[PDB]
Design a protein around this ligand. Sequence first.
Ligand SMILES: *[C@@H]1O[C@H](CO)[C@@H](O[C@@H]2O[C@H](CO)[C@@H](O[C@@H]3O[C@H](CO)[C@@H](O)[C@H](O)[C@@H]3O)[C@H](O)[C@H]2NC(C)=O)[C@H](O)[C@H]1NC(C)=O
Ligand SMILES: *[C@@H]1O[C@H](CO)[C@@H](O[C@@H]2O[C@H](CO)[C@@H](O)[C@H](O)[C@H]2NC(C)=O)[C@H](O)[C@H]1NC(C)=O
Ligand SMILES: *[C@@H]1O[C@H](CO)[C@@H](O[C@@H]2O[C@H](CO)[C@@H](O)[C@H](O)[C@H]2NC(C)=O)[C@H](O)[C@H]1NC(C)=O
Ligand SMILES: *[C@@H]1O[C@H](CO)[C@@H](O[C@@H]2O[C@H](CO)[C@@H](O)[C@H](O)[C@H]2NC(C)=O)[C@H](O)[C@H]1NC(C)=O
Ligand SMILES: *[C@@H]1O[C@H](CO)[C@@H](O[C@@H]2O[C@H](CO)[C@@H](O)[C@H](O)[C@H]2NC(C)=O)[C@H](O)[C@H]1NC(C)=O
Ligand SMILES: *[C@@H]1O[C@H](CO)[C@@H](O)[C@H](O)[C@H]1NC(C)=O
Ligand SMILES: *[C@@H]1O[C@H](CO)[C@@H](O)[C@H](O)[C@H]1NC(C)=O
Lengths: 654, 214, 220
Amino acid sequence: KIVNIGAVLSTRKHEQMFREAVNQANKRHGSWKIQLNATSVTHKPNAIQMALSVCEDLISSQVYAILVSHPPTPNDHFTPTPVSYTAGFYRIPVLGLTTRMSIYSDKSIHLSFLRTVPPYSHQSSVWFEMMRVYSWNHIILLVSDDHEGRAAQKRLETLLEERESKAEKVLQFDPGTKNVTALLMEAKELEARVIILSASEDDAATVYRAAAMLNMTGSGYVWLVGEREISGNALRYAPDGILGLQLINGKNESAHISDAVGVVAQAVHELLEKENITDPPRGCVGNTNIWKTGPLFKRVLMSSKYADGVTGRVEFNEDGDRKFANYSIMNLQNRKLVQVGIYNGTHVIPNDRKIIWPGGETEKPRGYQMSTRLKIVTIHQEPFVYVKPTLSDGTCKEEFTVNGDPVKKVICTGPNDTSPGSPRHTVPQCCYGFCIDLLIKLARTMNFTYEVHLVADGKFGTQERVNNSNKKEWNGMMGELLSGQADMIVAPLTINNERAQYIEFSKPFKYQGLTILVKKRITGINDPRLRNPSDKFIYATVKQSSVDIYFRRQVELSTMYRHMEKHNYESAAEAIQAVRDNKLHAFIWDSAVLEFEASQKCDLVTTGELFFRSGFGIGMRKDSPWKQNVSLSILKSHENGFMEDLDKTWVRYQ
Amino acid sequence: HVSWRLLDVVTLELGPGGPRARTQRLLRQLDAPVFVAYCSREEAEVLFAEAAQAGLVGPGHVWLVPNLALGSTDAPPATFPVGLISVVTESWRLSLRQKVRDGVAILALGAHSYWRQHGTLPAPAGDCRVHPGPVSPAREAFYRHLLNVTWEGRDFSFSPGGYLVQPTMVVIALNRHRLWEMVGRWEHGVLYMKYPVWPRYSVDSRHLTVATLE
Amino acid sequence: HVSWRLLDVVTLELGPGGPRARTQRLLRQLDAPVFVAYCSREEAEVLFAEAAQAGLVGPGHVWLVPNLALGSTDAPPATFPVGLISVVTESWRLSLRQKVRDGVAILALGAHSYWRQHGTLPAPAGDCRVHPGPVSPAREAFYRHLLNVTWEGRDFSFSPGGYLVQPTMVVIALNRHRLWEMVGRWEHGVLYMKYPVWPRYSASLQPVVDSRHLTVATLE
Ligand SMILES: *[C@@H]1O[C@H](CO)[C@@H](O[C@@H]2O[C@H](CO)[C@@H](O[C@@H]3O[C@H](CO)[C@@H](O)[C@H](O)[C@@H]3O)[C@H](O)[C@H]2NC(C)=O)[C@H](O)[C@H]1NC(C)=O
Ligand SMILES: *[C@@H]1O[C@H](CO)[C@@H](O[C@@H]2O[C@H](CO)[C@@H](O)[C@H](O)[C@H]2NC(C)=O)[C@H](O)[C@H]1NC(C)=O
Ligand SMILES: *[C@@H]1O[C@H](CO)[C@@H](O[C@@H]2O[C@H](CO)[C@@H](O)[C@H](O)[C@H]2NC(C)=O)[C@H](O)[C@H]1NC(C)=O
Ligand SMILES: *[C@@H]1O[C@H](CO)[C@@H](O[C@@H]2O[C@H](CO)[C@@H](O)[C@H](O)[C@H]2NC(C)=O)[C@H](O)[C@H]1NC(C)=O
Ligand SMILES: *[C@@H]1O[C@H](CO)[C@@H](O[C@@H]2O[C@H](CO)[C@@H](O)[C@H](O)[C@H]2NC(C)=O)[C@H](O)[C@H]1NC(C)=O
Ligand SMILES: *[C@@H]1O[C@H](CO)[C@@H](O)[C@H](O)[C@H]1NC(C)=O
Ligand SMILES: *[C@@H]1O[C@H](CO)[C@@H](O)[C@H](O)[C@H]1NC(C)=O
């Protein structure tokens, strides 16, 4: 039972080296029960004749596993295609000594394949490890349009979704293009301060020179690239301080031979005993059939736990990855490279001396360039936000209060001067209230700069699957916050589960709930008049509100929505006049503002107690840098009786 | 715009000859009213035999399989449960002569469509030996000209990946006579039907009949 | 009251010369975190080595076996995973001299109980020349009187079956040095444990504590 294998190579000197290596590795066992062999050929330019030569190798010996390498020719992607396709028809295992392209990782197009060197996707994982070292959490992922680009983006997406913090505005550019300045200029606005790139070498030089023209290689920033972005001629356009990384002992592959035969040896003596092996597919013509045991041999070889090759302990993944290969981190230390870190799977050891960042500062630079002029959005609410027209002199009434202290007012732009019907009138109004004073305190504490402007929709905003069916984009104010129209939200805004996914909330500063309003009396939600709606009494709420979602997610209460959706004023405090008009009897709304209405006005009564608990709070975009501080500030105010004093001044004396 | 209360996902591996021991228990454990499967034809035969051994085959359960399996439409295989649903493109009229009539006609019409407006007849490539043509010439647009096409009322609108988009296709099922029969189709609009109710054709069974009044 | 949802019961053949393919095939396909197995020492060694072949001896799986195996109790053999769990009675480390002394003591205390009851012990009939096995009348009373005993804090007991009932027992394990160390005690139907959470070791100590378990602190 002479078990025979083969291996094709490139330089015809590594062929002699392979012959010597295989005959030396034959000395592992010589018990005469099992023997080994080898046959080697060299490459050729034409693909079709090369594949015919592979078929000649197939017929010339009942082969067991072919091995492939790369020649010094620069035709990268056209190198390993024919052998895999031809040998896949008989489930003949193939071993790629060195090929880093992404496409081969898919076991559905090259169903028989095994690799020892990891593809370009796996190095992305290393970045994540590095990303956790210095606490960077806002990224700018820059990638090309090639299949490797999609693979890298997908790998980084799943690895981020493991911890599931965020990605930040990935943008892809076409391959082999010039003047990429448009996308870079578009993405230069964002607050993130670290970029990641993985594309072609010429594309790397082009993006390097374009960023140099746009002045992005300067101080403070840092962006790191993959493996081939710091090779070839890309160094002729690269600035100092960009991180780089390569594999420990690649592109040699002679030592890699010393691994491959090894594992296949560790395979052969473990396979010939299963039950009924007895044959590989003999012939290369006419015999239209597959090997009866191909999948078995491939699966057994895949799970092989090899002991020690030249390149450490080598295993395989579910698809044939490198399984804990090594990586060396080099720095562009004044147009050179210095090995600063060793990545072996669990971390990167900073055993080196010093790392220089693109800015020249020798300390670890953080990203998240903090802005100074925010874009604050607000909404008209009776006891919290007061809006008035201005005196044509340039502002509105500057006068003392009951106590004599000046009530501070700002100037906010905003609406169209008429909510239901008007083209637009974007005019400045004078703008003062409780939340305005709280924002004044916050700005004084944290050195802010504010430009307040109202919403155009006039509504808070819920989920709405529009007639153009798609993902339900957020409505009005929340869409303005998410799209980038606004940057921070200060208003009497509820905190609910449906909003917690995309927004980060601060600690609540005023506890409040839901309560009924009538003009006398009434009861909570128990009466049959509400269990069974009556033609006399009318129950209406504010449309596009959190209460709409609350009544749109209750199983038993669904029918009340049937009433509520029938007629509900898509309106505001204007709908308050409904209770004055004796049309709408019951108005279900938030406790604080509706209770202030009872005290300020007359003949308006609130019945019973609350039936729901929530809270107001300042919200910001997902994982904004300010959160902690802002929250802390609010809590500190709550300690000093500031909130109680504001409560007194604004809604007590009434 | 629906709920789709999905039950669960299960992954199976079987070497049918000997290693299917744990697969039996794993297939016993499940419980769901709708099953959708995905495997090869021989793998389908062993999987359905194992399911029949397990017992989760009753008429109260329905199987769903893509066109990848059940390729041999012209021959109803054995050990297959009656009343499953599979979906195929327009191929009932297909045959050797049908494919012959389709292919050359579409290729020639595509060759002439680009000529219809300032065009010329194409020429073949070099050979399989010289390995020529590194660049993509203007004639590649001729290949791009083979995207939009129409004939015989059937829409052969294509896709940038090498397949057809907006297709006309039918949904099939196995009746009690062990022969593939037409059940419905999707003619560019919404689903059609020939049997408005599922006949659940064939003792410790399910889907009991319930009669009521309002 | 707990559900105790069984997964599978598997019977295997394990003779010194036997089909290894069948056992390996039946063992390689399994899915459960805990194991209970009933086998002898010469059986346990072979089965444990074969399980060590097919990757099932990590810090995630736990094995429990009765007192049938682990006969040596002083020389724990190889191929035994660290963390093996078994249950043995008291006198787990008592001296052989101490054991025989305790046996003589309980017999003497039973004899003393019989004299206090009636006055003396019965005469023996041990002729292995005749050996008639004539009749019960008197010796059965001595047996029934000896059926219960208690001496020097050791509370023994007996049943109609020749095995003592409800003694204080221990639950032992294997430390990181392949040595039997006491883990838990068992008295009067209430069970203790000296380790609040099962320390799981990996290839060499370095317990790779799980990612889905945490320590909550609270106060009265
Ligand atoms: C869809 O398939 C049709 C079927 O042949 C193809 O028609 C394309 O239609 C465009 C529309 O303008 C035509 O382009 C030509 O551009 C030249 C520019 O000077 C102009 O002089 C012509 O009068 C004509 O407008 C042309 O018929 C054809 N496109 C090309 C590139 O030849 C075409 O394959 C598909 N349509 C498209 C837009 O690709
Ligand atoms: C390719 O790798 C092999 C093995 O890692 C290298 O050969 C080793 O070279 C070192 C230094 O000269 C010696 O100490 C070892 O004894 C060699 N090992 C063997 C098995 O010969 C080889 O030099 C590498 N070639 C290149 C171009 O990097
Ligand atoms: C890979 O390299 C890392 C760092 O050089 C090694 O990490 C150490 O592993 C020990 C356990 O052997 C742990 O105490 C820590 O995780 C690390 N020790 C430290 C930081 O002092 C790791 O062992 C190496 N090998 C791998 C991951 O297989
Ligand atoms: C959050 O607040 C802390 C403390 O108020 C800020 O840290 C201070 O930053 C300034 C300028 O960068 C330093 O002069 C102080 O010494 C820092 N404080 C301490 C205690 O070291 C921090 O910058 C704030 N972060 C954000 C995002 O607002
Ligand atoms: C349990 O022990 C007690 C004494 O320790 C014994 O009970 C005596 O049994 C004799 C036998 O007929 C009778 O005199 C009485 O039933 C008991 N007498 C006294 C003074 O206790 C006996 O060994 C055990 N009990 C039983 C019921 O057998
Ligand atoms: C062994 O390899 C040599 C290499 O040329 C070949 O000639 C011979 O036929 C092979 N024999 C077997 C049994 O594989
Ligand atoms: C093209 O390059 C020029 C460089 O002078 C630049 O000004 C221009 O904005 C670029 N155009 C685009 C679309 O990027």
